[PDB]
Amino acid sequence: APQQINDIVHRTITPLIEQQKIPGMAVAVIYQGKPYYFTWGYADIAKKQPVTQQTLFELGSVSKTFTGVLGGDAIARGEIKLSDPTTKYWPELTAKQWNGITLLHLATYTAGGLPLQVPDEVKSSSDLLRFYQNWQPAWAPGTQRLYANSSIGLFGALAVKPSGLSFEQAMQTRVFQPLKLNHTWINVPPAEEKNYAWGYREGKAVHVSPGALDAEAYGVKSTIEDMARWVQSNLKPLDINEKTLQQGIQLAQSRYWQTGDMYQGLGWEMLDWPVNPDSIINGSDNKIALAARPVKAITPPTPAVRASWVHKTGATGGFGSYVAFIPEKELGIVMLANKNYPNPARVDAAWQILNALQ
Template sequence: MWSTRPVAPLVMAAALLMASNTAMAEKTQNLDELVNSTITPLMKQQDIPGMAVAVIVDGKTHIYHYGLADVKNQRPVTDDTLFELGSVSKTFTGIAGGYAVQSGILRLNDPVARYAPQLTSPQWRKITMLQLATYTAGGLPLQVPDDVDNTDALWLYYQHWRPQWTPGTQRQYSNASIGLFGALAVKNSGLSFDAFMKQHVFTPLQLNHTWINVPAEAEKDYAWGYRNGQPVRVSPGMLDAEAYGVKTTVKDMAAFMQANIDPEALAAKEAGLAKAIAIAQTGYYKIGDMYQGLGWEMYPWPADAEKVITASGNDLALKARPAKRLSPSRPVTAATWLHKTGSTNGFGAYIVFIPEKKVGIVMLANKNYPNPARVSAAWQILQKLP
């Protein structure tokens, strides 16, 4: 005759499991409602054709798709849709620079002339690679001028450029600055920037749908961006790969964010990359309340929402502001709001995460819309997470 004594514990275990699953389902439903109630009105207000959003909570990734990647052909946004990251690409460039540092082929405090001997003008013996990376070289412009369209013209441009301010004293956001940093950071590897990024960042993080140059087989997944209702994509330009050239999917960006939230998890298999991420997340200059890393912009957590949102607007973000070199540099801490906005003519991207809370959000859109609206939407979601 079978004993019935084990039944009570089994029933209790089953009940606990059912309760746990129910609680998890309710938590997911609440998150879905929170994200949908934030993103849907945002898209309507900003007239955004399509978006993909990833939210990380307690180490788990939740993916959301909205609208169309291609309006003409009614192609919906999916896990595989490729978006242009614009300046969010700079966080990848920062990690590439960090990898070059930890591998011994770059020293941030070296003068630029050490890596570009063709730049013989005296300022390049004083401006450091770190100052290029943090936009504090002395006033390089937002963009490389349009008439600089080949390598010879590029070097001639930098040779004749002169600092407006003493290097290291003012931060002025600049593709021409961090773009040159990226190109020179990988120079001693013998690899192109694209190849270096693939070998040392994309592949180790298993970002299998992340590209600088989208291959023919992935073109079918490449979204169209929209400007004034017309389809557009980013145009080639000098140092575009280093400053704003990455195209990727929401799933790859979620994996990238997870690695940045917890780089120590990479240490066993990818020790060099874990160190590179930590180097990129280090605060080297302080500008107001913000710390400037390699690509990343950071605020101590808890942060002031109004200040972070206001500072993301172009009227302040692109303005020259006093910068203070931190000595020693500020190592990354878990209680930090790390974020970056990015735009091309037809796309708008945003990534933010707080390592201490193990939460983060990626928002990819095929329209360039105001940065404060992106940061505000992410803040609304993050503040309501458990």
């Protein structure tokens, strides 16, 4: 790697790892379209296994970017439309509060207050139906944004129904395989367990637990190499040969709603570049990112703006991840760690690195 990339990365990440006590970390910088990789520390403390470019990390909510792109692919395939009512794909959803709630509302957290978490009590398909039938919106559709697994998770499950495929099968065949993400998984195979890092929470080794809509909302595990490739694909959709996936990537970066300085895409979130760093940094703190906020509709949605800071934070109980990229500069970063450390620290480090290279 160019010494300039080496210098800013090490000068930024070394202090970060010490201040946050991160056991292991992998970082990729995409610079003029080329990836450069960095690793530190331990994938497994107990067995002294180092983090490598093949270590799998839990992406948590960065998984929602794969869900949003897979949904965009279904749109491009003509299988679903964002302007279609939720009940078109779940007719058993007969409760009257669902009138007027479209797939767009589900994909973008604007259904009217769907909860952040699906309740642990919810498991079976009939358990989920009962949960959404009984749910009472606090707001009319399309008026407030409340970040929610039960929202985009449902979007993901419904968006693959016309394909007839399972959500995982659709993700593998329409997103992972065409993009050569050959070490990215909803379920980690036994052959790959040697590369699966442990997450660390209060010093205990943990992996994510199964839960309703986990695949759709926080279920992807991946390597720094595949995530670099994920970033490259989202920086330059036009180089992707499968037409509907290229189009679905563009749809996931369209701007559907605005709240404050931020624009909601499908999974991805976007701000105009150049950004005020305090705006994305403080904006990422859960105090703000998880709050109920009124939204302005963007009518009709703005297509992917190349002068944007496109990003997603993501966490599990034992992992913390961040992706950000600026399509206009062919510049991006992936930060994967096996500790859940605060979002603003992630974004601040990412901004220092990317601002130095832009």
